[PDB]
Amino acid sequence: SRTYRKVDPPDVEQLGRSSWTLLHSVAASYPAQPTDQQKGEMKQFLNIFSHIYPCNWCAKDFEKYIRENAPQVESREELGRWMCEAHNKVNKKLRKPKFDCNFWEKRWKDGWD
Amino acid sequence: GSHMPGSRTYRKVDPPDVEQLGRSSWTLLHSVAASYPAQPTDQQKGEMKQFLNIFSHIYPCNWCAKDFEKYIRENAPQVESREELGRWMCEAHNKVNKKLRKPKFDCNFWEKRWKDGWD
Ligand SMILES: Cc1cc2nc3c(=O)[nH]c(=O)nc-3n(C[C@H](O)[C@H](O)[C@H](O)COP(=O)(O)OP(=O)(O)OC[C@H]3O[C@@H](n4cnc5c(N)ncnc54)[C@H](O)[C@@H]3O)c2cc1C
Ligand SMILES: Cc1cc2nc3c(=O)[nH]c(=O)nc-3n(C[C@H](O)[C@H](O)[C@H](O)COP(=O)(O)OP(=O)(O)OC[C@H]3O[C@@H](n4cnc5c(N)ncnc54)[C@H](O)[C@@H]3O)c2cc1C
């Protein structure tokens, strides 16, 4: 109330945009040549994320997606592409335009100049 | 800042800075705490600890992550219930608030901010 303005909990939409920001940013700072431990932790991270993501149907669907499309974690390029395709699967459901994954790296890593 | 090549809705938005990444990631972390069970299973407890451990390794801000890793080491995540995990998350966020000279959030209002609203 006092120190901070009263703000309502995020809706599914706000949770989503916040969460893609984290997901794509995690991929953008993943190594080009990850260690075995980094590969395993990334797979584990995404598996648990799919269990705990705080939208029921979002999480359930994402778990099924991972089961059917194993995360590609051999390099940042692969993981970034995997994340882009995963995000595009959701865009397709929600009747959002397909994002061109050739721009994933500019959008989430390098910027536009 | 106009539309990216070949698109009609996606603008050339810059990668998030430390601030934008930060408020997005707090949104996810507190929201994770808010939908954690009152009575979690052993698997849920174990995965929550693993998730936060891995998060502390991979959080894309280097110094943010190293500090968070150290914070976890010194203040073990309290995962026996939603109430405990919310409070732990509020205290963790408050330690970063402290570092950054932002006000202390009164953790008694964590559930209203991240779960119940203010009606
Ligand atoms: C794992 C997950 C599952 C979800 N499932 C659902 C669901 O089932 N139903 C539902 O209603 N909501 C779901 N959400 C939320 C949904 O995807 C959106 O995040 C939310 O609706 C907000 O949409 P938005 O239009 O603001 O842009 P968002 O889709 O959140 O995207 C934000 C920005 O990401 C960039 N971007 C867009 N597409 C890509 C891409 N393919 N690759 C890289 N960058 C891209 C663009 O710059 C865009 O502006 C889910 C979210 C997550 C993280
Ligand atoms: C794990 C982690 C570590 C970070 N470490 C650093 C760092 O070392 N240095 C750095 O510059 N940035 C760091 N960041 C980012 C920083 O915490 C902020 O997110 C960023 O500066 C933007 O601040 P903000 O004013 O927009 O509000 P945020 O601090 O991002 O908070 C967003 C909202 O959360 C609510 N809130 C505030 N405090 C609490 C609380 N204690 N409990 C529950 N809800 C609360 C308020 O309503 C607030 O408006 C870190 C982020 C994370 C997620």
Side-chain angles (χ1 to χ4, degrees):
Chain A
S1 72
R2 209 287 86 196
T3 35
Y4 284 88
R5 219 86 279 136
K6 296 180 166 187
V7 175
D8 280 321
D11 61 17
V12 167
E13 178 193 319
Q14 302 176 291
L15 178 68
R17 73 169 57 90
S18 290
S19 300
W20 291 121
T21 293
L22 175 67
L23 291 173
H24 290 298
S25 293
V26 167
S29 74
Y30 191 68
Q33 296 175 278
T35 65
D36 291 328
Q37 177 190 356
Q38 284 166 327
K39 294 180 202 182
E41 285 201 345
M42 185 55 66
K43 299 172 185 187
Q44 212 180 352
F45 185 74
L46 295 166
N47 284 157
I48 300 167
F49 180 92
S50 82
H51 300 163
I52 71 179
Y53 183 66
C55 160
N56 291 351
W57 67 88
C58 305
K60 251 37 206 71
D61 285 1
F62 192 58
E63 186 184 349
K64 184 172 169 166
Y65 186 85
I66 287 165
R67 177 195 322 140
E68 304 189 343
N69 311 265
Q72 300 292 289
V73 299
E74 297 310 291
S75 69
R76 172 177 64 242
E77 177 154 9
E78 285 160 83
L79 211 213
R81 176 62 53 130
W82 187 88
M83 206 70 70
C84 183
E85 284 160 3
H87 191 160
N88 270 340
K89 178 74 169 201
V90 185
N91 289 339
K92 185 182 176 300
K93 191 204 163 174
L94 298 178
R95 293 236 321 120
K96 301 179 186 294
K98 182 172 179 193
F99 187 95
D100 184 349
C101 298
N102 288 333
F103 295 102
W104 177 85
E105 186 178 32
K106 290 177 162 107
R107 172 65 186 95
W108 295 109
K109 187 177 156 270
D110 292 337
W112 302 94
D113 257 48
Chain B
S2 68
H3 287 130
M4 67 179 68
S7 173
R8 304 309 158 178
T9 101
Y10 301 120
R11 305 194 162 248
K12 295 185 204 153
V13 181
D14 288 345
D17 59 28
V18 176
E19 286 65 43
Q20 251 300 304
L21 178 67
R23 66 184 64 98
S24 291
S25 304
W26 289 120
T27 289
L28 172 70
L29 292 173
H30 293 295
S31 286
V32 166
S35 57
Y36 193 65
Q39 293 173 309
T41 58
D42 283 342
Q43 188 71 19
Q44 283 165 331
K45 290 172 187 190
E47 295 195 353
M48 185 53 68
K49 296 174 191 178
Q50 297 176 48
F51 179 83
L52 296 170
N53 279 165
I54 296 152
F55 189 95
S56 81
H57 297 168
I58 70 178
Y59 187 57
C61 165
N62 282 356
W63 63 86
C64 306
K66 286 164 148 61
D67 287 343
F68 194 61
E69 188 179 338
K70 182 194 179 195
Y71 185 86
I72 283 167
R73 187 194 310 146
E74 300 177 359
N75 306 275
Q78 300 296 296
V79 299
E80 303 303 309
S81 75
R82 176 172 57 241
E83 175 152 23
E84 293 166 77
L85 218 211
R87 179 55 65 115
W88 187 90
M89 208 70 69
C90 181
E91 290 170 3
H93 197 164
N94 272 339
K95 190 73 165 256
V96 182
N97 283 336
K98 190 161 172 249
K99 184 195 199 288
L100 297 178
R101 302 190 294 279
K102 293 168 178 291
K104 172 165 183 164
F105 186 99
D106 184 347
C107 291
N108 280 326
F109 296 95
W110 179 89
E111 197 193 9
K112 287 166 147 66
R113 174 63 183 86
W114 291 109
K115 187 171 158 284
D116 292 343
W118 303 93
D119 298 78

